[PDB]
Amino acid sequence: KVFTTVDNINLHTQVVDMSMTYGQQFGPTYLDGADVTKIKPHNSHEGKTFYVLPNDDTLRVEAFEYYHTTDPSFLGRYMSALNHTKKWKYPQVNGLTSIKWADNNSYLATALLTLQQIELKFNPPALQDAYYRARAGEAANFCALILAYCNKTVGELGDVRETMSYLFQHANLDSCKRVLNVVCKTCGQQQTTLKGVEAVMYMGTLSYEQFKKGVQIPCTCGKQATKYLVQQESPFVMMSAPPAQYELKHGTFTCASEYTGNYQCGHYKHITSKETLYCIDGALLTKSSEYKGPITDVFYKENSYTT
Amino acid sequence: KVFTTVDNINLHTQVVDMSMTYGQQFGPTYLDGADVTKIKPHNSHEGKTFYVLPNDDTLRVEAFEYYHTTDPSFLGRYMSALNHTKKWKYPQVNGLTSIKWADNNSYLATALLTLQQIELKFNPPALQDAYYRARAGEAANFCALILAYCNKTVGELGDVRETMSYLFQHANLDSCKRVLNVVCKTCGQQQTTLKGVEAVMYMGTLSYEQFKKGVQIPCTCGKQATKYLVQQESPFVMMSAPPAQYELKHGTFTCASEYTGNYQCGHYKHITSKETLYCIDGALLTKSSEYKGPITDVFYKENSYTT
Ligand SMILES: CN1CCN2c3cc(C(=O)NC4(c5ccc(NC6CCOCC6)c6ccccc56)CC4)c(N)cc3OC[C@@H]2C1
Ligand SMILES: CN1CCN2c3cc(C(=O)NC4(c5ccc(NC6CCOCC6)c6ccccc56)CC4)c(N)cc3OC[C@@H]2C1
Ligand SMILES: [Cl-]
Ligand SMILES: [Cl-]
Ligand SMILES: [Cl-]
Ligand SMILES: [Cl-]
Ligand SMILES: [Cl-]
Ligand SMILES: [Cl-]
Ligand SMILES: [Cl-]
Ligand SMILES: [Cl-]
Ligand SMILES: [Cl-]
Ligand SMILES: [Cl-]
Ligand SMILES: [Cl-]
Ligand SMILES: [Cl-]
Ligand SMILES: [Zn+2]
Ligand SMILES: [Zn+2]
Ligand SMILES: [Zn+2]
Ligand SMILES: [Zn+2]
Ligand SMILES: [Zn+2]
Ligand SMILES: [Zn+2]
Ligand SMILES: [Zn+2]
Ligand SMILES: [Zn+2]
Ligand SMILES: [Zn+2]
Ligand SMILES: [Zn+2]
Ligand SMILES: [Zn+2]
Ligand SMILES: [Zn+2]
Ligand SMILES: [Zn+2]
Ligand SMILES: [Zn+2]
Ligand SMILES: [Zn+2]
Ligand SMILES: [Zn+2]
């Protein structure tokens, strides 16, 4: 005798035949992340709640309302990550929820720390609820959700900028706006405008001040141009560039991705400017005044910048 | 001035404009595994050969002839694994090509060692050529191919039995045949027959002798039955079962998968019966007479067994 859900908000009452297994009466069934499909209902977990897959239209609508997918694989990939992430340790590091290193989760830690430091509202209630609970220190469900929403499995190598990009795509960034302009000696002037995720991300450089002062592109014409920002209305910007030695000076950035190693065969650290510089490497904490090292993402805080 | 290929057998001669980059004249282009799409043709690699994606019908047929896919992602996922696997070390361990531990490749090592010990003919010439060359000690291309053919990326956690199953599906196993029979007290007797991959794999048990003496299934009727083998015509069989403590006795099996840890969060070792028992753990070698430990796959050698 059990409860089933797809969202864990709405609970459905089900009495489970006690020699039938779970994946036969309900269908794919789970318990705290464990595939319990092939298991018989034992006296131990009577009265507990089980995630199931949406098998009538009520459950289907509930799953969309909460996760904003109709992907039948979604729930299974989420249960499969939770089974691991719930076994990770999430230590508080300088008042941030971090992740002790496991299962190549270095990039998740760096994402998780960044997310606590930028102002982000998630569209799927499931991401939002799990984000709140992660900020409070219970970040297993959030991490398992990040893996599901990015189509990563536990252990897969990950890109912090790519993870962010996908997460930003599930966040309300509608009020975000970027007015670019490119100087074309031949074609002239031509004012691109970007809203959403595209108004918050750039991949040419780390320095927000260098963006403001014009970055190089090759104009339609062929040879090089300069591409500078005219208006940046957003709560933050994320500047990225392939990893390189870079001086992070204290007080001029919110936080940064440090990455050491080859493309994919490498390890991310998080660097964040508080009253001094903090290197957060999973459960480990380093504190320094200046910092030179290989950075690939820097986060900046905005309101409404105009050129 | 370069050569392009998709197979590396057929070489196409191309002269490459020397201020245009590669991914503009050809398309997605590669060099020894490196995405060279965004790179200009430098004097260093003139006269070398580049993998490209199939962009006319000649290249398309050549790619199928060699790899047996028409999947446009195939070649890119392969180049992306090669870039890593070519950096792995492949030490000879007791006359077998093994892999020094990197990038969670424990399951690949165990597959690679097993593959050198069972009799397997691959259908895609690319797998066959790279298998020969791996048996000789140059196993980077084979491993990168295994990752591509299984849709694994480098670092992903892997299942040795699942990898084998997919590889078997690209091998000639047409002469393989399994005649089962199930004892149903109510329904009666009923002689299943299996050919191909399905005639070589079983997931209930490790002991081939226990298979021969009948394994438990629940007959259509509901309650339990016994399912035993009547004819096993194949060069080998692979017996698998979820990991458990198990005594491998020397001389009664070809090789075995040892796995320690949780579902997915674990580490594979290879155990192989030569003149004594060898534990091969990547580049490391242990030798013992008996062996108790957590086994999940055992390989056996056959000709044409009849009950
Ligand atoms: C489709 N995606 C793309 C790859 N992606 C991925 C990337 C990474 C990764 O490493 N991403 C970084 C990176 C490292 C190195 C680069 N280029 C070097 C070339 C010359 O040397 C210095 C820089 C980069 C050049 C462009 C952009 C990112 C570069 C650290 C930021 C990783 N860890 C896991 C990953 O999972 C799979 C996922 C699948
Ligand atoms: C779709 N596939 C399925 C999972 N799959 C995978 C499995 C593994 C893995 O671990 N596979 C083993 C395994 C371990 C443990 C099991 N069950 C325990 C339950 C009770 O405790 C003892 C046994 C098993 C029960 C059935 C079958 C295999 C079991 C060692 C053999 C792994 N490393 C990476 C993987 O990548 C992704 C890939 C995606
Ligand atoms: Cl949506
Ligand atoms: Cl969304
Ligand atoms: Cl590498
Ligand atoms: Cl590595
Ligand atoms: Cl200060
Ligand atoms: Cl300071
Ligand atoms: Cl084919
Ligand atoms: Cl094939
Ligand atoms: Cl685990
Ligand atoms: Cl682990
Ligand atoms: Cl002997
Ligand atoms: Cl012996
Ligand atoms: Zn309901
Ligand atoms: Zn949505
Ligand atoms: Zn979505
Ligand atoms: Zn785990
Ligand atoms: Zn890592
Ligand atoms: Zn122009
Ligand atoms: Zn200061
Ligand atoms: Zn570290
Ligand atoms: Zn040709
Ligand atoms: Zn084929
Ligand atoms: Zn295929
Ligand atoms: Zn690598
Ligand atoms: Zn491993
Ligand atoms: Zn029956
Ligand atoms: Zn002996
Ligand atoms: Zn080991």
PDB file of N, CA and C in Angstrom, chain B residues 110-180:
ATOM      1  N   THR B 110      38.446  -3.819 -20.156  1.00  0.00           N
ATOM      2  CA  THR B 110      37.927  -5.165 -19.957  1.00  0.00           C
ATOM      3  C   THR B 110      37.308  -5.702 -21.243  1.00  0.00           C
ATOM      4  N   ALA B 111      36.648  -4.835 -22.015  1.00  0.00           N
ATOM      5  CA  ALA B 111      36.154  -5.280 -23.312  1.00  0.00           C
ATOM      6  C   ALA B 111      37.312  -5.625 -24.242  1.00  0.00           C
ATOM      7  N   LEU B 112      38.273  -4.712 -24.338  1.00  0.00           N
ATOM      8  CA  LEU B 112      39.387  -4.890 -25.248  1.00  0.00           C
ATOM      9  C   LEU B 112      40.135  -6.188 -24.960  1.00  0.00           C
ATOM     10  N   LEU B 113      40.401  -6.483 -23.682  1.00  0.00           N
ATOM     11  CA  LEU B 113      41.048  -7.750 -23.347  1.00  0.00           C
ATOM     12  C   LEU B 113      40.166  -8.949 -23.720  1.00  0.00           C
ATOM     13  N   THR B 114      38.870  -8.893 -23.387  1.00  0.00           N
ATOM     14  CA  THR B 114      37.966  -9.982 -23.767  1.00  0.00           C
ATOM     15  C   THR B 114      37.960 -10.204 -25.273  1.00  0.00           C
ATOM     16  N   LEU B 115      37.921  -9.118 -26.041  1.00  0.00           N
ATOM     17  CA  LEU B 115      37.798  -9.255 -27.488  1.00  0.00           C
ATOM     18  C   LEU B 115      38.988 -10.002 -28.079  1.00  0.00           C
ATOM     19  N   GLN B 116      40.179  -9.817 -27.504  1.00  0.00           N
ATOM     20  CA  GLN B 116      41.360 -10.532 -27.967  1.00  0.00           C
ATOM     21  C   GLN B 116      41.325 -12.013 -27.617  1.00  0.00           C
ATOM     22  N   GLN B 117      40.345 -12.454 -26.849  1.00  0.00           N
ATOM     23  CA  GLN B 117      40.353 -13.820 -26.390  1.00  0.00           C
ATOM     24  C   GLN B 117      39.174 -14.624 -26.905  1.00  0.00           C
ATOM     25  N   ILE B 118      38.174 -13.970 -27.489  1.00  0.00           N
ATOM     26  CA  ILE B 118      37.108 -14.685 -28.167  1.00  0.00           C
ATOM     27  C   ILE B 118      37.216 -14.463 -29.682  1.00  0.00           C
ATOM     28  N   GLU B 119      36.630 -15.404 -30.428  1.00  0.00           N
ATOM     29  CA  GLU B 119      36.758 -15.493 -31.877  1.00  0.00           C
ATOM     30  C   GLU B 119      35.627 -14.706 -32.529  1.00  0.00           C
ATOM     31  N   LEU B 120      35.964 -13.541 -33.080  1.00  0.00           N
ATOM     32  CA  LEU B 120      34.961 -12.556 -33.478  1.00  0.00           C
ATOM     33  C   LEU B 120      35.326 -11.941 -34.821  1.00  0.00           C
ATOM     34  N   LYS B 121      34.427 -12.001 -35.788  1.00  0.00           N
ATOM     35  CA  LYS B 121      34.619 -11.343 -37.079  1.00  0.00           C
ATOM     36  C   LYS B 121      33.647 -10.182 -37.237  1.00  0.00           C
ATOM     37  N   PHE B 122      34.207  -8.983 -37.391  1.00  0.00           N
ATOM     38  CA  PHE B 122      33.419  -7.763 -37.465  1.00  0.00           C
ATOM     39  C   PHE B 122      32.938  -7.499 -38.885  1.00  0.00           C
ATOM     40  N   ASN B 123      31.700  -7.053 -38.999  1.00  0.00           N
ATOM     41  CA  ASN B 123      31.125  -6.751 -40.307  1.00  0.00           C
ATOM     42  C   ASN B 123      31.657  -5.441 -40.914  1.00  0.00           C
ATOM     43  N   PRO B 124      31.646  -4.299 -40.218  1.00  0.00           N
ATOM     44  CA  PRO B 124      32.268  -3.091 -40.801  1.00  0.00           C
ATOM     45  C   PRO B 124      33.766  -3.278 -40.960  1.00  0.00           C
ATOM     46  N   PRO B 125      34.286  -3.237 -42.185  1.00  0.00           N
ATOM     47  CA  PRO B 125      35.746  -3.290 -42.360  1.00  0.00           C
ATOM     48  C   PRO B 125      36.525  -2.387 -41.419  1.00  0.00           C
ATOM     49  N   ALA B 126      35.937  -1.281 -40.963  1.00  0.00           N
ATOM     50  CA  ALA B 126      36.659  -0.358 -40.098  1.00  0.00           C
ATOM     51  C   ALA B 126      36.920  -0.976 -38.732  1.00  0.00           C
ATOM     52  N   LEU B 127      35.904  -1.626 -38.159  1.00  0.00           N
ATOM     53  CA  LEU B 127      36.097  -2.335 -36.901  1.00  0.00           C
ATOM     54  C   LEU B 127      37.091  -3.474 -37.067  1.00  0.00           C
ATOM     55  N   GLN B 128      36.973  -4.224 -38.166  1.00  0.00           N
ATOM     56  CA  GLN B 128      37.873  -5.344 -38.398  1.00  0.00           C
ATOM     57  C   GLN B 128      39.315  -4.882 -38.541  1.00  0.00           C
ATOM     58  N   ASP B 129      39.547  -3.846 -39.346  1.00  0.00           N
ATOM     59  CA  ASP B 129      40.920  -3.404 -39.544  1.00  0.00           C
ATOM     60  C   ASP B 129      41.503  -2.889 -38.238  1.00  0.00           C
ATOM     61  N   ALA B 130      40.706  -2.137 -37.478  1.00  0.00           N
ATOM     62  CA  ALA B 130      41.206  -1.567 -36.236  1.00  0.00           C
ATOM     63  C   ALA B 130      41.338  -2.633 -35.163  1.00  0.00           C
ATOM     64  N   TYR B 131      40.566  -3.712 -35.261  1.00  0.00           N
ATOM     65  CA  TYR B 131      40.720  -4.796 -34.305  1.00  0.00           C
ATOM     66  C   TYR B 131      42.048  -5.504 -34.537  1.00  0.00           C
ATOM     67  N   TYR B 132      42.335  -5.822 -35.790  1.00  0.00           N
ATOM     68  CA  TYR B 132      43.625  -6.462 -36.122  1.00  0.00           C
ATOM     69  C   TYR B 132      44.715  -5.602 -35.545  1.00  0.00           C
ATOM     70  N   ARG B 133      44.674  -4.315 -35.836  1.00  0.00           N
ATOM     71  CA  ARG B 133      45.763  -3.399 -35.423  1.00  0.00           C
ATOM     72  C   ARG B 133      45.828  -3.257 -33.906  1.00  0.00           C
ATOM     73  N   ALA B 134      44.739  -3.552 -33.220  1.00  0.00           N
ATOM     74  CA  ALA B 134      44.727  -3.485 -31.747  1.00  0.00           C
ATOM     75  C   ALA B 134      45.360  -4.752 -31.210  1.00  0.00           C
ATOM     76  N   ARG B 135      44.973  -5.884 -31.791  1.00  0.00           N
ATOM     77  CA  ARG B 135      45.642  -7.120 -31.399  1.00  0.00           C
ATOM     78  C   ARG B 135      47.157  -6.985 -31.520  1.00  0.00           C
ATOM     79  N   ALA B 136      47.626  -6.223 -32.515  1.00  0.00           N
ATOM     80  CA  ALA B 136      49.045  -5.925 -32.693  1.00  0.00           C
ATOM     81  C   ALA B 136      49.585  -4.889 -31.699  1.00  0.00           C
ATOM     82  N   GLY B 137      48.731  -4.189 -30.944  1.00  0.00           N
ATOM     83  CA  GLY B 137      49.183  -3.209 -29.968  1.00  0.00           C
ATOM     84  C   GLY B 137      48.851  -1.738 -30.244  1.00  0.00           C
ATOM     85  N   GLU B 138      48.229  -1.395 -31.377  1.00  0.00           N
ATOM     86  CA  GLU B 138      47.829  -0.019 -31.692  1.00  0.00           C
ATOM     87  C   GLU B 138      46.304   0.061 -31.605  1.00  0.00           C
ATOM     88  N   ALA B 139      45.788   0.150 -30.375  1.00  0.00           N
ATOM     89  CA  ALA B 139      44.362   0.018 -30.107  1.00  0.00           C
ATOM     90  C   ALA B 139      43.615   1.351 -29.972  1.00  0.00           C
ATOM     91  N   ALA B 140      44.253   2.490 -30.240  1.00  0.00           N
ATOM     92  CA  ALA B 140      43.527   3.750 -30.139  1.00  0.00           C
ATOM     93  C   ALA B 140      42.329   3.770 -31.089  1.00  0.00           C
ATOM     94  N   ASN B 141      42.545   3.479 -32.353  1.00  0.00           N
ATOM     95  CA  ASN B 141      41.434   3.598 -33.320  1.00  0.00           C
ATOM     96  C   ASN B 141      40.319   2.621 -32.970  1.00  0.00           C
ATOM     97  N   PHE B 142      40.668   1.417 -32.523  1.00  0.00           N
ATOM     98  CA  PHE B 142      39.655   0.442 -32.143  1.00  0.00           C
ATOM     99  C   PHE B 142      38.794   0.980 -31.005  1.00  0.00           C
ATOM    100  N   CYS B 143      39.439   1.466 -29.937  1.00  0.00           N
ATOM    101  CA  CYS B 143      38.697   2.042 -28.822  1.00  0.00           C
ATOM    102  C   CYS B 143      37.834   3.218 -29.277  1.00  0.00           C
ATOM    103  N   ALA B 144      38.411   4.164 -30.018  1.00  0.00           N
ATOM    104  CA  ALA B 144      37.581   5.268 -30.491  1.00  0.00           C
ATOM    105  C   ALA B 144      36.415   4.745 -31.316  1.00  0.00           C
ATOM    106  N   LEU B 145      36.627   3.666 -32.078  1.00  0.00           N
ATOM    107  CA  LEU B 145      35.515   3.093 -32.834  1.00  0.00           C
ATOM    108  C   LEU B 145      34.485   2.455 -31.903  1.00  0.00           C
ATOM    109  N   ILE B 146      34.936   1.730 -30.863  1.00  0.00           N
ATOM    110  CA  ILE B 146      33.988   1.119 -29.926  1.00  0.00           C
ATOM    111  C   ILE B 146      33.088   2.188 -29.306  1.00  0.00           C
ATOM    112  N   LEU B 147      33.690   3.295 -28.865  1.00  0.00           N
ATOM    113  CA  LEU B 147      32.895   4.402 -28.352  1.00  0.00           C
ATOM    114  C   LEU B 147      31.905   4.902 -29.398  1.00  0.00           C
ATOM    115  N   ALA B 148      32.325   5.020 -30.656  1.00  0.00           N
ATOM    116  CA  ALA B 148      31.395   5.542 -31.645  1.00  0.00           C
ATOM    117  C   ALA B 148      30.265   4.559 -31.886  1.00  0.00           C
ATOM    118  N   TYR B 149      30.588   3.278 -31.997  1.00  0.00           N
ATOM    119  CA  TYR B 149      29.564   2.316 -32.380  1.00  0.00           C
ATOM    120  C   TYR B 149      28.560   2.069 -31.262  1.00  0.00           C
ATOM    121  N   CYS B 150      28.959   2.286 -30.006  1.00  0.00           N
ATOM    122  CA  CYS B 150      28.070   2.180 -28.855  1.00  0.00           C
ATOM    123  C   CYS B 150      27.413   3.510 -28.464  1.00  0.00           C
ATOM    124  N   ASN B 151      27.717   4.612 -29.150  1.00  0.00           N
ATOM    125  CA  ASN B 151      27.267   5.946 -28.731  1.00  0.00           C
ATOM    126  C   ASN B 151      27.679   6.294 -27.294  1.00  0.00           C
ATOM    127  N   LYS B 152      28.903   5.942 -26.928  1.00  0.00           N
ATOM    128  CA  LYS B 152      29.536   6.444 -25.721  1.00  0.00           C
ATOM    129  C   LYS B 152      30.488   7.581 -26.092  1.00  0.00           C
ATOM    130  N   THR B 153      30.623   8.555 -25.194  1.00  0.00           N
ATOM    131  CA  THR B 153      31.681   9.535 -25.315  1.00  0.00           C
ATOM    132  C   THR B 153      32.770   9.181 -24.322  1.00  0.00           C
ATOM    133  N   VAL B 154      33.951   9.761 -24.534  1.00  0.00           N
ATOM    134  CA  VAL B 154      35.064   9.501 -23.635  1.00  0.00           C
ATOM    135  C   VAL B 154      34.740  10.069 -22.260  1.00  0.00           C
ATOM    136  N   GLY B 155      34.841   9.216 -21.240  1.00  0.00           N
ATOM    137  CA  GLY B 155      34.557   9.569 -19.863  1.00  0.00           C
ATOM    138  C   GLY B 155      33.251   8.992 -19.349  1.00  0.00           C
ATOM    139  N   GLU B 156      32.269   8.811 -20.241  1.00  0.00           N
ATOM    140  CA  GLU B 156      30.993   8.193 -19.892  1.00  0.00           C
ATOM    141  C   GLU B 156      31.243   6.871 -19.170  1.00  0.00           C
ATOM    142  N   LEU B 157      30.406   6.567 -18.182  1.00  0.00           N
ATOM    143  CA  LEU B 157      30.449   5.239 -17.577  1.00  0.00           C
ATOM    144  C   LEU B 157      29.871   4.199 -18.541  1.00  0.00           C
ATOM    145  N   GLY B 158      30.444   3.000 -18.533  1.00  0.00           N
ATOM    146  CA  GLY B 158      30.058   1.974 -19.483  1.00  0.00           C
ATOM    147  C   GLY B 158      29.834   0.622 -18.838  1.00  0.00           C
ATOM    148  N   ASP B 159      28.996  -0.174 -19.497  1.00  0.00           N
ATOM    149  CA  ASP B 159      28.659  -1.535 -19.091  1.00  0.00           C
ATOM    150  C   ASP B 159      29.326  -2.534 -20.037  1.00  0.00           C
ATOM    151  N   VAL B 160      30.197  -3.384 -19.486  1.00  0.00           N
ATOM    152  CA  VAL B 160      30.972  -4.305 -20.323  1.00  0.00           C
ATOM    153  C   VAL B 160      30.039  -5.234 -21.111  1.00  0.00           C
ATOM    154  N   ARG B 161      29.036  -5.808 -20.432  1.00  0.00           N
ATOM    155  CA  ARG B 161      28.037  -6.639 -21.104  1.00  0.00           C
ATOM    156  C   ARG B 161      27.262  -5.856 -22.170  1.00  0.00           C
ATOM    157  N   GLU B 162      26.891  -4.611 -21.872  1.00  0.00           N
ATOM    158  CA  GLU B 162      26.190  -3.814 -22.872  1.00  0.00           C
ATOM    159  C   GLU B 162      27.088  -3.460 -24.047  1.00  0.00           C
ATOM    160  N   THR B 163      28.366  -3.156 -23.788  1.00  0.00           N
ATOM    161  CA  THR B 163      29.290  -2.856 -24.884  1.00  0.00           C
ATOM    162  C   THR B 163      29.478  -4.071 -25.776  1.00  0.00           C
ATOM    163  N   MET B 164      29.694  -5.223 -25.151  1.00  0.00           N
ATOM    164  CA  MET B 164      29.820  -6.472 -25.877  1.00  0.00           C
ATOM    165  C   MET B 164      28.605  -6.697 -26.765  1.00  0.00           C
ATOM    166  N   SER B 165      27.406  -6.567 -26.180  1.00  0.00           N
ATOM    167  CA  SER B 165      26.171  -6.822 -26.911  1.00  0.00           C
ATOM    168  C   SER B 165      26.118  -6.005 -28.195  1.00  0.00           C
ATOM    169  N   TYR B 166      26.435  -4.713 -28.092  1.00  0.00           N
ATOM    170  CA  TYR B 166      26.435  -3.855 -29.269  1.00  0.00           C
ATOM    171  C   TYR B 166      27.514  -4.283 -30.264  1.00  0.00           C
ATOM    172  N   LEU B 167      28.715  -4.598 -29.767  1.00  0.00           N
ATOM    173  CA  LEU B 167      29.773  -5.053 -30.647  1.00  0.00           C
ATOM    174  C   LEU B 167      29.385  -6.360 -31.329  1.00  0.00           C
ATOM    175  N   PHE B 168      28.826  -7.310 -30.572  1.00  0.00           N
ATOM    176  CA  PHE B 168      28.345  -8.552 -31.171  1.00  0.00           C
ATOM    177  C   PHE B 168      27.362  -8.271 -32.290  1.00  0.00           C
ATOM    178  N   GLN B 169      26.561  -7.222 -32.139  1.00  0.00           N
ATOM    179  CA  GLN B 169      25.598  -6.863 -33.169  1.00  0.00           C
ATOM    180  C   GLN B 169      26.264  -6.370 -34.452  1.00  0.00           C
ATOM    181  N   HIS B 170      27.542  -5.999 -34.405  1.00  0.00           N
ATOM    182  CA  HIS B 170      28.285  -5.626 -35.604  1.00  0.00           C
ATOM    183  C   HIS B 170      29.248  -6.714 -36.052  1.00  0.00           C
ATOM    184  N   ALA B 171      29.094  -7.924 -35.519  1.00  0.00           N
ATOM    185  CA  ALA B 171      29.931  -9.060 -35.851  1.00  0.00           C
ATOM    186  C   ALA B 171      29.106 -10.109 -36.581  1.00  0.00           C
ATOM    187  N   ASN B 172      29.775 -10.888 -37.429  1.00  0.00           N
ATOM    188  CA  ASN B 172      29.159 -12.063 -38.040  1.00  0.00           C
ATOM    189  C   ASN B 172      29.009 -13.123 -36.957  1.00  0.00           C
ATOM    190  N   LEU B 173      27.771 -13.297 -36.486  1.00  0.00           N
ATOM    191  CA  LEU B 173      27.402 -14.372 -35.576  1.00  0.00           C
ATOM    192  C   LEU B 173      26.266 -15.203 -36.170  1.00  0.00           C
ATOM    193  N   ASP B 174      26.219 -15.269 -37.508  1.00  0.00           N
ATOM    194  CA  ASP B 174      25.098 -15.915 -38.187  1.00  0.00           C
ATOM    195  C   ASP B 174      25.099 -17.429 -37.969  1.00  0.00           C
ATOM    196  N   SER B 175      26.270 -18.058 -37.860  1.00  0.00           N
ATOM    197  CA  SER B 175      26.315 -19.501 -37.633  1.00  0.00           C
ATOM    198  C   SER B 175      26.027 -19.887 -36.185  1.00  0.00           C
ATOM    199  N   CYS B 176      25.685 -18.926 -35.322  1.00  0.00           N
ATOM    200  CA  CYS B 176      25.447 -19.190 -33.910  1.00  0.00           C
ATOM    201  C   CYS B 176      23.990 -19.539 -33.682  1.00  0.00           C
ATOM    202  N   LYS B 177      23.759 -20.540 -32.835  1.00  0.00           N
ATOM    203  CA  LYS B 177      22.449 -21.153 -32.698  1.00  0.00           C
ATOM    204  C   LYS B 177      22.302 -21.708 -31.283  1.00  0.00           C
ATOM    205  N   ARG B 178      21.137 -21.462 -30.681  1.00  0.00           N
ATOM    206  CA  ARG B 178      20.808 -21.903 -29.329  1.00  0.00           C
ATOM    207  C   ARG B 178      19.411 -22.502 -29.341  1.00  0.00           C
ATOM    208  N   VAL B 179      19.295 -23.760 -28.941  1.00  0.00           N
ATOM    209  CA  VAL B 179      18.000 -24.413 -28.826  1.00  0.00           C
ATOM    210  C   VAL B 179      17.694 -24.512 -27.339  1.00  0.00           C
ATOM    211  N   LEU B 180      16.743 -23.710 -26.879  1.00  0.00           N
ATOM    212  CA  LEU B 180      16.307 -23.789 -25.498  1.00  0.00           C
ATOM    213  C   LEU B 180      15.114 -24.733 -25.388  1.00  0.00           C
TER     214      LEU B 180
END
